Ligand binder design. Structure first.
Ligand SMILES: *[C@@H]1O[C@H](CO)[C@@H](O[C@@H]2O[C@H](CO)[C@@H](O[C@@H]3O[C@H](CO[C@@H]4O[C@H](CO)[C@@H](O)[C@H](O)[C@@H]4O)[C@@H](O)[C@H](O)[C@@H]3O)[C@H](O)[C@H]2NC(C)=O)[C@H](O)[C@H]1NC(C)=O
Ligand SMILES: *[C@@H]1O[C@H](CO)[C@@H](O[C@@H]2O[C@H](CO)[C@@H](O[C@@H]3O[C@H](CO)[C@@H](O)[C@H](O)[C@@H]3O)[C@H](O)[C@H]2NC(C)=O)[C@H](O)[C@H]1NC(C)=O
Ligand SMILES: *C1O[C@H](CO)[C@@H](O)[C@H](O)[C@H]1NC(C)=O
Ligand SMILES: [Mg+2]
Lengths: 48, 48, 106, 91, 507, 190, 47, 84
């Protein structure tokens, strides 16, 4: 398992983030050539 | 940005001029309520 | 002024910088009216031929008093030695709303 | 909705009871630990969950950290907490 | 803003608009915002000469500020409550100038003679209109006329702006705000303009229009506004802590009975515990206060029954705690009322001839009494309403003490449950909540007349339904709570709190 | 549109400056204002003036509006006229609705109107009129006030006693008469 | 009202424009540390 | 029915959290009647920003107004503790 920390250092604006892991034939994940493995999380202000 | 305003004092004494302004889309505003002295028509003198 | 004095044999002349900024710190944009003159104990002699009108960009301005005009202000450079020069600036915003008069003397 | 149960059992392969260890947990995309269950495991001795991790609510808590004061080397120290689905997404 | 004290007479001129622009939905709600006021005003003890005038095109004087009944809130409320909207439906006009014109006479003394110390009287006009007035001129001039009558704003160093508080409630939908403000009093750092929405959550409204300058001392008084912290609701409440070797930390509670004293259970401490091992936390501030001495009740003894088989004896389980520093009463730090005192007398609004026995009857009648005890849940002071089994069920409730730990092999129940005890909890007549270990020493209060009177002190219980940091699930029917009746230890509280200037009844 | 302005002055002296205005219509930028002696007002406003369908209901509504302050049945006694504004000294014969002005029946309250409104209502002498306006039309300081016949001023001709007999003025005599009683004892419907 | 802006009735104008304020007097009787007392004042900045 | 989706949750949660503050808006707004003009000026402005953001259901404006309205609340809470 690899970590991907998304930092948000805005004053008072929680961010609606869309993170995606690009596909790569060298690795085997949920993301394939025709399928995108993308989440849609939210990050509180001045936090990660 | 300067904004002109033509006015005509009617009564003497410490009167009150008030202007307000708000921006569209942005939720900001600021009003100013300063006071100016309204003196009649006379000239200083010191008769002996 | 670049120097806190003036060298009589200085070709460049008396260089003066006009700095104008709002009370809240922000820089000022406008036009300034700067003049010079010589002082003698209590008497002042204005120099009409030194009147300049320099723009004020980025809250800064640059004005110079050429030695040529200075000497022409009187009628013996070594004589002016001991006297003093005074600068009188007057900045006016591009909005023509406010006006300030500054002055450096001595 | 679906609400499942996550049970974790561990043991130290040493002669002595391992000291203070850490439990790094990663939820299944669309699952958040039950708040109430976390309080229970927190108040319990030999276990600790920082206040920072507590008041996060179902939303942002995909990663959990349960600090342990010790782990037995004889038998297995097992704990369990409830998890709820709030996101629903295929695969 | 609105001085509040019997040290001077006051006046409340209630003017209400009853024209068509108000409507039945807001006129009825306009009365509620005057009825509840009188109650919260009388709860402070002050006795204002109420004036009530409903107006439209021609006002209708219900109550005059000169009558002898203008000081009986119970009657003024009756009148206001009986005031039917459609009293005048013919003249839907809104002549406000005329209404205030009548109010002028209320304070307009009879001719060339200023009454006894007239100027010391406060004047408060509470007009409830929608600003939309058709008939008459501008009611502003009236405010300027009254401005002179009360000799206000007519002197240099003596403005007298403290004797005129004009409040305006914008009732009805479409309301001319511009007009209202002009009428309302213009004072700095004060509020006099209230609108429709303000109605909901009335407590918040009353807050602004009240300053307890001289009622900073009144006991059992509580603010209920939503913007109030836990201690704004329970000022008397106090959190006591006992630190000692191998003792971890003992958690108990108490109630501020005086400037220097705090009442709590006597079983929370011991002769061994020192005075610097006990810290009292009053309200909110995590600033512990050093105590001076713990006054245990002379009759207290938890080991008095080393022979009979009663490991723990909770009889006379009361102890006062004199703080090392004097407390200054605030919105979050106020005393609670104690039985058989001058405070409780005026708190219950009873004649000066009220005896100690009459209070015990009103507070603790032979029946099911509505009581309550303050408890903390996750650092939150929540109120728990319970019932006192003082009636016939008193026996059925007290006999459940045979289930208590170390209370099985007991000769007699009247040996462990002394008359010094009140009984609560159970499932009759209602499912009463239970007290936990942390709540020990908590006050047993009887909410009456908007005031709070303490009549008991949490001593012990039968079942610990409050396991550990929790409480609920499956509570036994014999889960009873016992509290030390403050009437049974009167002579003691009457002895220690003698110099606290409380005013105990010599009777 | 707002009148422009041009200011001239030396760089060394701001006090000694001169400023002129300019407007495509108005004199020289100077706004419109009515003034007498040393008492001027913001006359920057409109005027006030074929008998559509004035009924008993059309009046009860416009006579119970917000600004509605005063309502009188007056009789014009004297008519003076100046080069900068006219006026009418009318005596109140009854106070249908008392306003901010404490006036008893019989006294005279001065009314003022622009010289351009001489064609509005030719207020003849010794004739009755029903009028009502706003409190913002008051002019001067109490007790010496003065009414202003502005845009919100209602001026109507009140027929005489022996004029309601005419079979053409009856429709108005009954409306005015009913409007009177509907105001003195009853009041506005709001 | 529905516009993405603030109405006139919701704009509280700034009026307090003093040229010189905070003409107060404070004594330093606080617990001294290294001969240097420290008082924390909560002032109300003008408009 | 089963469950929400991507923008189906976070966008609703923020809406609820913003509404919770808007409910007790009149409570805080009326609480500045005794406080200074600053609090009365800040809350009447931060008030609309929260309402307009709610109806728009815009994640950005709702959050932007949530802390805008939350800050002023806290500043009022502290402004009262100096008054008891
Ligand atoms: C009573 O009345 C008199 C007359 O009005 C007032 O006297 C005037 O008051 C002011 C303040 O004292 C004086 O201002 C001063 O002006 C001087 C001199 O004027 C100068 O003249 C020389 C030579 O021409 C030049 O420098 C200039 O032309 C300049 O005008 C100036 O040097 C000072 O800087 C100062 O400002 C003014 O002079 C004076 N006017 C007169 C005397 O006519 C007086 O204030 C008033 N009050 C009382 C009770 O005495
Ligand atoms: C005083 O007058 C006001 C203004 O007329 C009254 O407020 C009104 O109250 C009703 C009932 O609560 C509200 O109706 C509601 O409509 C909403 C939809 O917006 C709906 O969700 C509710 O279920 C209810 O049907 C109404 O909004 C409101 N009118 C307004 C604010 O324009 C009030 O009832 C009167 N009483 C007092 C003393 O407040
Ligand atoms: C009235 O009140 C004032 C102010 O308290 C007081 O000084 C005075 O003695 C009182 N008597 C009268 C009627 O002036
Ligand atoms: Mg009405």
């Amino acid at each position: 398992e690899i970590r991907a920390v998304l930092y948000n250092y805005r004053q008072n604006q929680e961010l609606k983030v869309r993170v995606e892991l690009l596909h790569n034939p060298a690795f085997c994940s949920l993301a394939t050539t025709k399928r995108r493995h993308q989440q849609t999380v939210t990050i509180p202000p001045k936090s990660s | 940005l300067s904004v002109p305003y033509v006015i005509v004092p009617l009564k003497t004494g410490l009167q009150e001029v008030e202007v307000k302004a708000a921006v569209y889309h942005h939720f900001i505003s600021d009003g100013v309520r300063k006071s100016l002295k309204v003196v009649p028509e006379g000239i200083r003198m010191n008769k002996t | 002024p670049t120097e806190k004095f003036y060298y009589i044999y200085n070709e460049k002349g008396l260089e003066v910088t006009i700095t104008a900024r709002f009370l809240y710190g922000k820089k000022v944009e406008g036009t300034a009216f700067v003049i010079f003159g010589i002082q003698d104990g209590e008497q002042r002699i204005s120099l009409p031929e030194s009147l300049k009108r320099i723009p004020i960009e980025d809250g800064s301005g640059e004005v110079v008093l050429s030695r040529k005009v200075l000497l022409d202000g009187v009628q013996r450079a070594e004589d002016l030695v001991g006297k003093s020069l005074y600068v009188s600036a007057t900045v006016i915003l591009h909005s023509g709303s406010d006006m300030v008069q500054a002055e450096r003397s001595g | 909705k679906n609400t499942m149960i996550l049970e974790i059992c561990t043991r130290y392969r040493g002669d002595q009871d391992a000291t203070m260890s850490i439990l790094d947990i990663s939820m299944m995309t669309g699952f958040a630990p039950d708040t109430d269950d976390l309080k229970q495991l927190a108040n319990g001795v030999d276990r600790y969950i920082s206040k920072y991790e507590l008041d996060k609510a179902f939303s942002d808590r995909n990663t959990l950290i349960i600090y342990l004061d010790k782990v037995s080397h004889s038998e297995d120290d097992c704990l369990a907490f409830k998890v709820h689905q709030y996101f629903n997404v295929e695969l | 803003k609105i001085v509040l004290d019997p040290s001077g007479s006051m006046n409340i001129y209630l003017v209400l608009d009853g024209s068509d622009s108000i409507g039945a939905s807001n006129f009825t709600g306009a009365k509620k915002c005057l009825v509840n006021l009188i109650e919260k005003v009388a709860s402070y003890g002050v006795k204002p000469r109420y004036g009530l005038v409903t107006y439209a095109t021609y006002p209708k004087i219900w109550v005059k500020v000169s009558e002898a009944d203008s000081s009986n809130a119970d009657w003024v409320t009756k009148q206001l409550n009986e005031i039917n909207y459609e009293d005048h439906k013919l003249k839907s006009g809104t002549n406000t100038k005329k209404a205030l014109q009548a109010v002028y006479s209320m304070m307009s003394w009879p001719d060339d003679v200023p009454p006894e110390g007239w100027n010391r009287t406060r004047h408060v006009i509470i007009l409830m209109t929608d600003g939309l007035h058709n008939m008459g001129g501008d009611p502003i001039t009236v405010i300027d006329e009254i401005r002179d009558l009360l000799y206000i704003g007519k002197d240099r160093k003596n403005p007298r702006e403290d004797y005129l508080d004009v409040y305006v409630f914008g009732v009805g939908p479409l309301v001319n705000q511009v007009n209202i403000n002009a009428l309302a009093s213009k004072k700095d750092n004060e509020q006099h303009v209230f609108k429709v929405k303000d109605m909901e959550n009335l407590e918040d409204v009353f807050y602004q229009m009240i300053d307890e300058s001289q009622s900073l001392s009144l006991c059992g008084m509580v603010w209920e506004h939503r913007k109030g912290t836990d201690y704004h609701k329970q000022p008397w409440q106090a959190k006591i802590s006992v630190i000692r070797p191998s003792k971890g930390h003992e958690s108990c509670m108490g109630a501020v009975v005086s400037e220097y004293f705090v009442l709590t259970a006597a079983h929370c401490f011991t002769v061994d515990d020192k005075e610097h091992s006990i810290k009292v936390s009053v309200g909110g501030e995590k600033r512990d206060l050093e105590i001076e001495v713990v006054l245990f009740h002379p009759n207290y003894n938890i080991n008095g029954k080393k022979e009979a088989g009663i490991p723990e004896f909770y009889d006379y389980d009361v102890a006062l705690i004199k703080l090392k520093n004097k407390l200054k009463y605030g919105q979050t730090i106020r005393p609670i009322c104690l039985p058989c005192t001058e405070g409780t007398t005026r708190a219950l609004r009873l004649p000066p001839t009220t005896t100690c026995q009459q209070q015990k009857e009103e507070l603790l009648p032979a029946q099911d009494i509505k009581a309550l005890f303050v408890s903390e849940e996750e650092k939150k002071l929540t109120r728990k309403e319970v019932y006192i089994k003082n009636g016939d069920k008193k026996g059925s409730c007290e006999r459940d003490a045979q289930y208590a730990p170390g209370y099985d092999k007991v000769k007699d129940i009247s040996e462990v449950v002394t008359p010094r005890f009140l009984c609560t909890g159970g499932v009759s007549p209602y499912a009463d909540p239970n007290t936990c270990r942390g709540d020990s020493g908590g006050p047993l209060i009887v909410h009456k007349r908007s005031r709070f009177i303490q009549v008991g002190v949490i001593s012990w219980g039968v079942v610990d339904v409050c396991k550990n940091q929790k409480r609920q699930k499956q509570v036994p029917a014999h889960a009873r709570d016992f509290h030390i009746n403050l009437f049974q230890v009167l002579p003691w509280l009457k002895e220690k709190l003698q110099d606290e200037d409380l005013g105990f009844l010599a009777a | 549109i707002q009148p422009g302005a041009v200011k001239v002055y030396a760089y060394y002296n701001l006090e000694e400056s001169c400023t002129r205005f300019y407007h495509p219509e108005k004199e020289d930028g100077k706004l419109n204002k009515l003034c007498r002696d040393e008492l001027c007002r913001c006359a920057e406003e409109n005027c006030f003036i074929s008998d559509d369908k004035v009924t008993l209901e059309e009046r009860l509504d416009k006579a119970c509006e917000p600004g509605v302050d005063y309502v009188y049945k007056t009789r014009l006694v004297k008519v003076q006229l100046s080069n900068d504004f006219d006026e009418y000294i009318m005596a109140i014969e009854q106070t249908i609705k008392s306003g901010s002005d404490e006036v008893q029946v019989g006294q005279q309250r001065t009314f003022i109107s622009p010289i351009k409104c001489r064609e509005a209502l030719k207020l003849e002498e010794k004739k009755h009129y029903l009028m009502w306006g706003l409190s913002s039309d008051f002019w001067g300081e109490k007790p010496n006030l003065s009414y202003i016949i502005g845009k919100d001023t209602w001026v109507e001709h009140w027929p005489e006693e022996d004029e309601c007999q005419d079979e053409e003025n009856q429709k108005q005599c009954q409306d005015l008469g009913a409007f009177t009683e509907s105001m003195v004892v009853f009041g506005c419907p709001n | 009202l529905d516009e993405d802006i603030i109405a006139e009735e919701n704009i509280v104008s700034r009026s307090e424009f003093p040229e010189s304020w905070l003409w107060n007097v404070e004594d330093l009787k606080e617990p001294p540390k290294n001969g240097i007392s420290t008082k924390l004042m909560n002032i109300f900045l003008k408009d | 029915t089963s469950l929400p989706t991507s923008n189906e949750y976070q966008n609703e949660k923020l809406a609820n959290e913003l509404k919770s503050l808007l409910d007790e808006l009149n409570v805080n707004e009326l609480a500045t009647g005794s406080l200074n003009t600053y609090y009365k000026r800040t809350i009447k402005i931060s008030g609309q920003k929260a309402m307009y953001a709610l109806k728009s259901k815009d994640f950005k404006k709702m959050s932007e107004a949530k802390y805008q309205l939350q800050k002023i609340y806290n500043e009022i809470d502290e402004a009262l503790k100096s008054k008891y």
